[model samples]
Target: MVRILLINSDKPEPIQFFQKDKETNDSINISVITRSCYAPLYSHWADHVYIVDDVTDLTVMKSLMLEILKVGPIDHIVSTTEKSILTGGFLRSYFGIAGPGFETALYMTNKLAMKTKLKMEGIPVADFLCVSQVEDIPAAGEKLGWPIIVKPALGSGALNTFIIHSLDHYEDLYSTSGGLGELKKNNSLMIAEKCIEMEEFHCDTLYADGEILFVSISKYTIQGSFILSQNDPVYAEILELQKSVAQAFRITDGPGHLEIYRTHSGELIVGEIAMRIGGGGISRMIEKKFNISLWESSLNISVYRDPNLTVNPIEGTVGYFSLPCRNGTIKEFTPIEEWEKLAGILEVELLYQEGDVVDLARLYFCLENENEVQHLLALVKQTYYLHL
Candidate 1:
């Protein structure tokens, strides 16, 4: 059996990919280092669950890993959490594992560095500048113009991200409590960049030996300030752009998730890239649509020196959407049995439950809604609704 160590499994729920892998009978051992509160979920699949309050401490992680290694050899180490990616990269290096180096991971973490590298490599990106104080805003604005996005250099899931349409908007966002500067000191103002007006999309892939073994493209739908939904399609432009980015970054192996946009001028602009799977049900959609299990891919890449993996295209048109949260007390989800009756509909998974505190701000609501609608429509088109 191959042993894979997962960092930060204490998330609100077991990641979709992890659960799917468990059902596939893959030869794997799951060791979770996360909070005690999530023990039950990990208990179901994790071979060994280590409940730790803090994974940020290197000493704690190293000590725990040493004990785990003593029990059995660890083939690979993987992490999906944004905060844990760097630490995972560190641990991979410490163990002399085959994965992206610390420098490559760091470059991917810092948006400024990522854009700089892409720009240097002739990859078109939005005009951006990093600011440390109020004084720097004017200069940056003069160069990039208005309608810019202001947010932390290292943030995910659209938290604290804002679209600055004017100087007043920028000033208001900057003055707000827990604004960009409040998170960090010294050079911690914000990264402001010209916002691109285009249809956005996310691409997830696994690279091995400088070759992309699997790739999936999803059309993104933005609701409010965050990406809410994505639909998979065979887009040649997106595939070409993804290939270019992988080559530009010199991403040889491991998992990578990238967000890109089709500009008004028919140009594809790279938004952000990460060395791990994207959050917000992307891994789930990838599994449901492409039939390529990401958890297995991560494990295989992490364990065997030579991972045998290939991207298998979906057989038919398959789409994924999440149910939208609109001021409701989960008065019984629209009947799971009823949802499965749709045409070309493969599966539907609801994350909410009855009496679950209803807060649109608390969950990735937009994506949820988009996913639900697409699945429902497909069912209706297939005349499966008649059975319900």
Candidate 2:
């Protein structure tokens, strides 16, 4: 029997990964830790549940740790949350679990430090300055130019992040109250960087014992800056670039999600890397296109199991999008069948339905090729309408 600690510090998802865990580990014991808000969603899955106010808080995590430790030694310590990576690393080291350490997780979570270290390794990253004092922000922006990207140095998730094109907004951005401010003063964090203009792509890879085992590359082509999707045209070149990034980051074990940028000038720059499976439907898209669960692959590597790795990367476009919709009940959607019937459209899943009141409705789409992707997006913009 294997005792596994699976924590989700982010939104709950249908973890097909954990489902696979049941099949692979005979007599497995699973404990799940999630926010109290998400406990209801995750409760039925794991044997034990540790609900917390915040998964990253030291006190809360320690409490959970103490609770879990009392049960006996945990064979595996893993998490899928960006919030959990660093904390997971610390806990792994504390428990002598088989996993990457705190410094590796630090390099993954802290943008300023990761880029700085990668830059030293000759990885192409946008020029950045880690601004500790609010007074230094303006000068940092001056060096970078207007339209700099201001974000927390210690974490991902971009709502609190901003594109500072002017001094006034840039000043007010960090002026009042928020984690961005706290991060600056407390963690000596907050990074101001020269914004790189490029088409964004995600490269997710799994490694075992310092060897590359799996790689998947997906591009973002629809609306972005925050819009997330995958299942687009993939190429050999992109995967090669990502291989170097994984090597430079010294990711020799487990999974790494690498965000990359290909500039219009034919240069590829390393955008950011997360030492876990990517969020934002990337995991799902990979499974749909390649029959691989990144989460499953990641966990397989982590537990020293032989992972069935992807050999040839899947091509031809397949991705997803979400749009704003009317927030009321008994709404109507006309294209439910029409969407799936399109020539290039392969699948359509309505994320909402009639009698559902919601601020937004999401629809996932699969496209046939590069030619159909843009066309499908145009159709999506015109067709996917919900009535209040």
Candidate 3:
């Protein structure tokens, strides 16, 4: 039987990708390494489960390495979380597993490294430079032009990210406690890149044996909201760039959550790419529309098995949104059951309840036209009230 090691830093959805197969013929032996808090959620799925406080800590990983090896040699190493990619690469190299190693994983997670490689390969990435010192940020701003974007090379979301409009802006913002010095103290590399105003699109893709098995493009209509792309004017351009990025990175199989930028002047630029399923409800939206699990396809590719890429003939434009949470303990809101029962609404995930401090809620739905999406969102904004 094949032996597999899965390093998890997120939710328990990954277990579903391989659990059924594990029960059938014992074709593979499953082992998991996850945070102590998440151990309970993952304990019942794997043959061996190990808990760690920090999955990326060198000492902790090395200790677990020895313990996991006693069972047998690991044949596959997989990680779907952004923070755990390097750990997955380390384990793969240590065990001689057949998958992406440290170098490839580095390019996927580090913005500077990823852009450098893609730029070298003639891929269309914004000009960027590594900024080691706060003093050097001015030079990067001058070179990349004013209003350059500054952020950590190894992080996601808007945390520690900045936009410097000019020299005065840079000095005024970083004159205090937060700046390159603080980032260095915490062991993160900072990068400054040319900022391009564009409409952002994310391409969730599946590749197998040097070919793109499937691709789904969704455009950001608003913050934390996406509309499935249908008859997009830039569809061809986006598809080409997505394929180019996969090839440039030597990605033969598995999943890619790629970002693209469409400039107002009709240019498409490769923003960045991650070698895993996207965040929020992207995977769930894809599953509802395509009738296939990206998680399942990704796992299959890691183990050198054929992925299920058959697309279903589904209709309507599927949309997903992460609703903002008011800054207070929730008191009252529309019932989740009522939201799910609404017309064209596929799913409503209530992340917080009464008396719980909330961060966000999620909704997935389908509509006959893009304009209908806007109408539905406006309706949601009017009716979905939170009395906090």
Candidate 4:
């Protein structure tokens, strides 16, 4: 039986991800290294559950990994979270396990390194430069142009991201408490990219055995949610780009979450790619559209086993929406059960609850056609009445 170790910093309650493999391969040993607070959840299914305050801290993880090794050999090391990617890679390398090591992980996690390597590969990317302080922006603007996007070198989501239109605008932001000011205070590594007014797209693919096994492509809509179309021609091109990205990163076995941009001039520019499943409702969306679990595919690859993914004929378009909310207490909204009962609704993941502070809440659903997307979006807004 193969032994697998999973390093996770976030909760996997929504998907019950562990159950997929646990049921599929009953003999394989499953060990989980996760945060202290989430240990209770893993304790049930995992053969061995290790707890840590922070899963990304290499020092902490190394010590815990030593303890885990006392039991038996670990055949594979897998991390599905962005923050733990480097730590996972390091552990695998240190133990001589089969997986992406630190070098490949860095190329996927660090924005500066990722972009630099892509640029060296002759890949089309927006002009960018490293920035250590506010003084660096003016020179970068001169080179990359005004309205540059300044963000952390190793950031997730929109944390500490700012758009600087001019020197004065940058200064204004730096003086503030959050965003660039905090990044500058800690001297965090950052980068500024030439802002491109274009449509954003993402391709999620599974790679193994020197080839891409499966792919799902989607684009952000003007409406609050993003749409996935299996029949679209754009999906084919996006997959083509993703295959190149996978090769560039030397991802022999794993999933690649690649983003791209289409300029108004019809140029396809590569955006940064992560070596894990795409965040938010992306996995759920893919599962709804393609009838496969990226989490399971990732695990199979980690163990050097073929995921054996078969392409299913997909029809129509599927849509995913994360309710947009401002900071405020949740006054009222559609109950989870009600949303699940609605037609065309595949899954409804409630990120927040009644009386809780609103942060992230979402639902993934099916559509009869592309035109019905906007109409259903409007219906969703009417159903979920968040006072905030």
Q: Give per-residue CA lDDT, model 1, range 1-388, as digits (tens).
A: 8677877654543355556666785676778777788678778876888888866566888888889889887777766677667667778778777677656776677787778888888888877788776556657776888777667776452665766677776677667765544433434436887776777877788887788887767666412122222252436767777888878777788888888887767777888888777565676666655557776676567554455555555444344444446664545445555555444445555566656655121111222345565544454445321110
How well is each residue in 184-268 modelled by candidate 4, as lDDT tens digits? Answer: 6746788788776788898887877767788778877613345566567677777777767776778877888888998888788
Pairs of residues clashing in candidate 2 = 231-318, 330-355
**Predicted structure 3, TM vs. truth:** 0.86
lDDT of 4 at 313: 43
Question: What's the TM-score of each model vs. the native?
Answer: 0.71, 0.82, 0.86, 0.84
Tell me the whole-model lDDT of each prediction, alpha carbons only. Answer: 0.65, 0.69, 0.77, 0.76
Looking at model 4, which ten-residue stretch has the lowest summed lDDT? 222-231
lDDT tens digits, residue span 240-313, model 2: 77767666666668788888887788678888888867665566666666777666567777666777765443
Better of 2 and 3 by lDDT: 3
Q: Of the candidates numbered 1 and 4, which has the greater TM-score value?
A: 4
Instruction: Tell me the TM-score of model 1.
Output: 0.71
Q: Which stretches of candidate 2 lie over 4 Å from their true place?
A: 10-26, 41-47, 58-67, 133-135, 171-188, 222-236, 309-316, 324-334, 359-369, 386-388
Q: Output the lDDT of residue 1, model 4.
A: 69
| RMSD values, in order shown | 6.9, 4.3, 3.2, 3.6
Count backbone overlaps in model 1. Answer: 12
- Runs of candidate 3 with Cα error greater than 4 angstroms are 18-27, 43-47, 51-67, 142-146, 155-158, 164-186, 222-231, 334-343
